[PDB]
Each structure stands twice: as structure tokens, then as C-alpha cells.
Design a protein around this ligand. Sequence first.
Ligand SMILES: [Co+2]
Ligand SMILES: [Co+2]
Ligand SMILES: [Co+2]
Ligand SMILES: [Co+2]
Ligand SMILES: [Co+2]
Ligand SMILES: [Co+2]
Ligand SMILES: [Co+2]
Lengths: 9, 100, 275
Amino acid sequence: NLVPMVATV
Amino acid sequence: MIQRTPKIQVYSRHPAENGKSNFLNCYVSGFHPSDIEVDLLKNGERIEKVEHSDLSFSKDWSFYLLYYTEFTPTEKDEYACRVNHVTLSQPKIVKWDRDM
Amino acid sequence: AGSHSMRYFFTSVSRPGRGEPRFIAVGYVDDTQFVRFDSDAASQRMEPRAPWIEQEGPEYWDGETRKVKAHSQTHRVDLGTLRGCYNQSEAGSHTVQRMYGCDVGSDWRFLRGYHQYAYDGKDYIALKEDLRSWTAADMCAQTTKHKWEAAHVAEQLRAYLEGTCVEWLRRYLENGKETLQRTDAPKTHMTHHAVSDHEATLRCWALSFYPAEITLTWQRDGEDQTQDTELVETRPAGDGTFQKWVAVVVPSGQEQRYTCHVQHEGLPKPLTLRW
Ligand SMILES: [Co+2]
Ligand SMILES: [Co+2]
Ligand SMILES: [Co+2]
Ligand SMILES: [Co+2]
Ligand SMILES: [Co+2]
Ligand SMILES: [Co+2]
Ligand SMILES: [Co+2]
């Protein structure tokens, strides 16, 4: 189950 | 760096016997950058029906792939893996040695 | 088995002449791939790669597809941002790589979590062991760290690693128990190949094993020997299991003083092989 959000660098 | 040359192992899935269907593997690992060309050869000719795994990588970030095809070994037929990558001035051909 | 992990691996590779980066995602429980996404493939969906994940219903697949596409877009944006920070041209291809996941112990409780990110194969930014702050490798990553500190990015990620990640790992271990919680001990044997008339290679083989972690050790008179040895990288068989060998060159006639030990989770006691 993937992480729900992925912040941009 | 961004560039490290692939390690190459060429092997059958099972211990090879003549006339018995098997899988020929070329495992390439430890490489960067990711762009790579791998062909499996039968008596020097590129084999057409070749599959590969999804690109993944190790702890040090270097990449690995498995290329594979079903084959039925015979006494006379010779097999190999041909790899090209930015670290290699020409393609590298590694022969299948059925003891390795 | 009991220590277990769930890990995801993501690679994006830019295509500077035209269009968007190539994006590949793969998910594992221990050493078993269970899902994949490839931007070049036709489905444009997260796809199953193990039978036990096919249990999951449409809401699961919709959600994982949505998230994996969101991962892909963050990678796309990052490739642009990083090209700018390093003052690189539009000419060259560049890569981002991300790996994250969680480990549970035998009691199936949280043991540790992790999230690492690289640009062009070099460390960029990673979560520290405490899951509270970031390790930035260079000054571009330091700018990212300040941004992420202000936006409380670690706190969100930590919630997942200690929460959803370990909860769904336990779910998958239960659903796939028949394979995921089964150890496949190595099938071992030794071969012997003359190098000349007066020396020979002994090769200790371990085949068809799971999980991938293994130790092969050569001994002479019961003490470890590393000189004149060769150990290959553990390699996939292609059927879900793994292979490895270790070799030693010995004087011919002296094979009997050498022993190979094989250690693996599937063996109650290490094996000892002797020619
Ligand atoms: Co392909
Ligand atoms: Co604050
Ligand atoms: Co808060
Ligand atoms: Co012999
Ligand atoms: Co020889
Ligand atoms: Co000599
Ligand atoms: Co011993």
C-alpha cells in the first residue's frame, strides 16, 4: 500500500 | 560516479540437460547509468523471444535486471549474453558455461 | 518468517529530446515482487505480480494506480527542479531513484522505517532512523530539507511508515502466508573441476532458496579461508527463488581438508559440505 502523498523536492 | 560497468552472470534456471526445456538467464547488476542493451545469443544470432524483469536497484543505487528466455539445450548449440553500456568500448559477450 | 519488510522502489529517467520521463515502480514483501507499474506499458495501471495480491478488490487497485501516478508526477517535477539547482543543460538524461518501506520483527511490531532519494545515483536526501528529520547530502538537498521542515513532510511520512505500512505488511503476510511465511531451504551440492593436473576448483552450490539472504563460507581445517576464493552475487532463478555459489582453488589430492558451510533461515543448523 503506497504512501498517500509524495512532496516535491 | 554516475557510471559503473555491469556485472554479468549467464546461467540456466535448472541444471542443463540436452532435450529438456529450461530457461536461459542473463543477470546484469551493479551498473550506472541505467541505460543498457542486453541480447541473448544462440550460435551468435540474437534470440527474439526475450523477456526482462522490471528495473530495480540495490542499496548503493546501482541497477539490476534479469533477461531470460525459454530454451531447450542441445549438445552442439552455443549460447551467450551480449551487453552494451556506456562503460564498454565494444559490446561484451559472455558465454554460457553450463558449470557456472 | 519473522523479520519481514515491505519496500517500494521507483526509478524515473528523463527523455530530453521529447516527452515525459520513463517511470518504473516495483513493490516487494521480503524478496517477493507483488506489484509493478511501468509508464511504457499499455495498462497505465498498478499491476499484480503475486497471486495473493489478486485477492484485493477494485478500490485497492484504483487507489494504488492513483498514488503511483502521483509518485510519477512528483518525480517528473523533481527532475526539472534538480536540473535547475545543478545548473544542467536540457541535453542530458538524468535519473531520480526512491526507496521506502518498513520492517517488522517476529512479534510483527514496527522495527524501523526508511525513505531514501538519489539524483543521478548519488544520495540527495534521506529520512534519518528516528523518522523525524532529514539527511541532506549537498546544498541543493539542504534547500529541500528546509522546505520539508517547514511543511512538516517527515511527520506525514512517519505516520505512514509506523501506521499503514506495517498494517498492510501484516495483511499481505497473512494473505500470502502459504508462500511468504514459508522458507525454502537451499538445495546444496559441491562440484569439482580440475584447473590443471595439480590444482582444482571446488564449488559449493546453493539452489532454489528463499528468502535471498544466505551465507556460504569455505574453511580449511575448520578455519575460515578467503584467499583463493570467489563468491558470486546472489542471483534470481526466475521462479521466485535464488541461487549462489562459492568456489575455492585447492591442490589436487587435498580436497578433503576443505569444508563449505551454508547458513540460511530455512536451515535449523548450518550445513557442512565436504568433497
Ligand atoms: Co522492455
Ligand atoms: Co512547523
Ligand atoms: Co503536526
Ligand atoms: Co573432478
Ligand atoms: Co576449466
Ligand atoms: Co602450478
Ligand atoms: Co566449520
